[PDB]
A = this chain, B = another copy of it.
Amino acid sequence: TACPEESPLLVGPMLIEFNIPVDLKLVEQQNPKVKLGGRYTPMDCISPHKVAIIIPFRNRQEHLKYWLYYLHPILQRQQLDYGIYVINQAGESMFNRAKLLNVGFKEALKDYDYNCFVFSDVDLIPMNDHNTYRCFSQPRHISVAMDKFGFSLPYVQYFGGVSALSKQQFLSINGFPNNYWGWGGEDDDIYNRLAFRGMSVSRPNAVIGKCRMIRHSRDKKNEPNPQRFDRIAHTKETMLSDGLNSLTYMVLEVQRYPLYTKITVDIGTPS
């Protein structure tokens, strides 16, 4: 007992494809050590990383299937004491990614003394298990080089896709904004919060930080290079009042599926 710096099981570069539809009954089968609700704890070593992976969700059951298929194996290989949480937005009104992420943080803590949080879109898979889904000395940007972006960071302050913050780092910035409702920029806002609290972004190199975007059918088109939203005055101004401390929502239901926990919640409408 006492986990090693790096993990022995690391396979490094991996093959990621989406032409092979999958069955969750299968992933369950292939990932036996994974207890109810998507929980897994190393049975040999003692991991210092209690990670809760939060996934903003809404009508992406297919993406979720591929996501679970790839990540569960990877995560156990990284020797992580982790849990999976799918925060499902109940309405049919604007999607609110950031807010669902805040909800995950709060809900997950009701289950375990997690000290680390990975916020991941369902449609992203890491192509190299050296890209550890854990927290670092500074906030982590994991999805650094994405196939949909020519494997190139859109700009240095891009903090979208997959990231990780320790409980401390997360609290430090008052969580994430709840007021971006799918208008875009919340991830730029979150980056602003980090700078204001004197933190910076820790990243893996562009080689191991390569990631695939779940897009079956033959899609090779390179998604338009995203721009940065300039709302720096706005973050400094609203940061302390929009976030964890202003977070309100109703848990409509909680389902402990074999491979993950699914929390359906009502988070409101915008105004």
Contact = CB atoms under 8 A, between A and B. Distances in A.
Interface of A: 92-95, 137-138, 150, 152, 154-157, 181-185, 191-192, 194-196, 198-200, 219, 221, 224-225, 227-230, 232, 269-270
Given A93-B195, A183-B195, 19 more contacts: A92-B137, A92-B200, A93-B199, A93-B200, A94-B195, A94-B199, A150-B221, A152-B219, A152-B221, A155-B224, A155-B227, A182-B195, A183-B191, A183-B192, A183-B232, A184-B228, A196-B270, A198-B269, A224-B225
Contacts of A183: 157, 191-192, 195, 232
Number of copies: 2
7 contacts: A92-B200, A93-B195, A94-B199, A155-B227, A183-B192, A184-B228, A224-B225
Contacts of A229: 230
Nearest to A152: B221
A14 to B, nearest CB: 20
Given A94-B200, A138-B92, A200-B93, A195 B224 contact: no
A210 to B, nearest CB: 13
A182 to B, nearest CB: 5
A89 B196 CA distance: 17
In order of increasing CB-CB distance, the 7 nearest A-B pairs are A198-B269, A93-B198, A94-B195, A224-B225, A181-B195, A94-B200, A183-B232
Nearest to A58: B200
A196 B269 CA distance: 8
A200 B90 CA distance: 13
A96 to B, nearest CB: 10
Nearest to A271: B196
A124 B49 CA distance: 40
A136 B211 CA distance: 36
Contacts of A154: 224
Contacts of A195: 93-94, 181-183, 270
A152 to B, nearest CB: 7
Contacts of A192: 183
A230 B231 CA distance: 10
Contact of A157 (B92, B182, B196): B182
Nearest to A199: B93
B185 A230 contact: yes
